[PDB]
Design a protein around this ligand. Structure first.
Ligand SMILES: C[C@@H]1CCc2n[nH]c(C(=O)N[C@H]3COc4ccccc4N(C)C3=O)c2C1
Length: 260
């Protein structure tokens, strides 16, 4: 269950140290006066997000709901996010990349099975622990309706590359599948796509017209099956994209057979 934490247990987004539980990431969403009577709804949204419990989905450890201060507290993932890892000094072996992909699939299938559409899947929202195991997060608060509203409330002192072309429409599971296709490409390219795009409006129109990440710009070995999977997952028509359970059933035997 979500802990009701107190500031007095701790010494923007910042690393934090709970005086008995240790390292944690804190996002303070609001700091101001008590202009807010969303208290019940803010806490309940936190409880709802905290009920999404899966090994590949981040844990919201606590919430701070105090007089003029509203904070979320999340486990610390010491390797940072997925793009940070892909660009690190030593490369990441193909068997670890394949396991990362499988864990992303499992986490996303869990979320969809609970009726949750992520809407902002991207390497920045894939967090990595020291063992190169991953957790899906929502660091832009696309799923924290109430906390996102509080973040831009009046009395408060405080990405395109992965978006399905229909949204450049009500996000669906298939919107997430498109985002996953581009994450697949980035995992093997070890970088963000579309580096040669000049202008944002150029990129939007190109993607809406059928432009996709440059498969030829992947320099290391990428299995043909993974190339085929990313192309299926970024099909223009969302109804042509598979589901994450359909992806898992194709990818898991391949992972066991050739990547593990
Ligand atoms: C898809 C996942 C479902 C379950 C879940 N539980 N917690 C989060 C989350 O992303 N929590 C961040 C949200 O706000 C932040 C933004 C930036 C940095 C840290 C946080 N913190 C503290 C969180 O708890 C999630 C998403």
């Amino acid at each position: 269950n979500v802990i009701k934490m107190k500031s007095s247990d701790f010494l923007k987004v910042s690393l934090a140290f709970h005086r008995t539980q240790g390292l944690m990431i804190m996002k303070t969403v609001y700091k101001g006066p008590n202009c807010i009577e969303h208290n019940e709804a803010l806490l309940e949204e936190a409880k709802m997000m905290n009920r999404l419990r899966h090994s590949r989905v981040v844990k919201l450890l606590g919430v701070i709901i105090e007089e003029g201060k509203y904070s979320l507290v999340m486990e610390y993932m010491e390797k940072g996010n997925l793009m940070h890892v892909l660009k690190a000094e030593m490369s990441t072996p193909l068997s670890v990349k394949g396991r990362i992909i499988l864990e992303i699939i499992e986490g996303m299938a869990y979320l969809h099975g609970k009726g949750v559409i992520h809407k902002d899947l991207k390497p920045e929202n894939i967090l990595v622990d020291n063992d190169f195991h991953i957790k899906i997060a929502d660091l832009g608060l696309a799923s924290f309706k109430m906390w996102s509203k509080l973040n831009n409330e009046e009395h408060n002192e405080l990405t395109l590359y992965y978006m399905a072309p229909e949204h450049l429409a009500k996000p669906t599971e298939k919107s997430d599948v498109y985002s996953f296709a581009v994450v697949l490409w980035a995992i093997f390219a070890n970088k963000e796509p579309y580096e040669n795009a000049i202008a944002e409006q150029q990129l939007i129109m190109a993607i809406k017209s059928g432009n996709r990440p440059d498969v030829d710009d992947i320099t290391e070995y990428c299995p043909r099956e993974i190339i085929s999977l990313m192309k299926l997952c970024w099909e223009a028509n969302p109804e042509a994209r598979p589901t994450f359970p359909g992806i898992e059933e194709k990818f898991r035997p391949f992972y066991l057979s050739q990547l593990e």
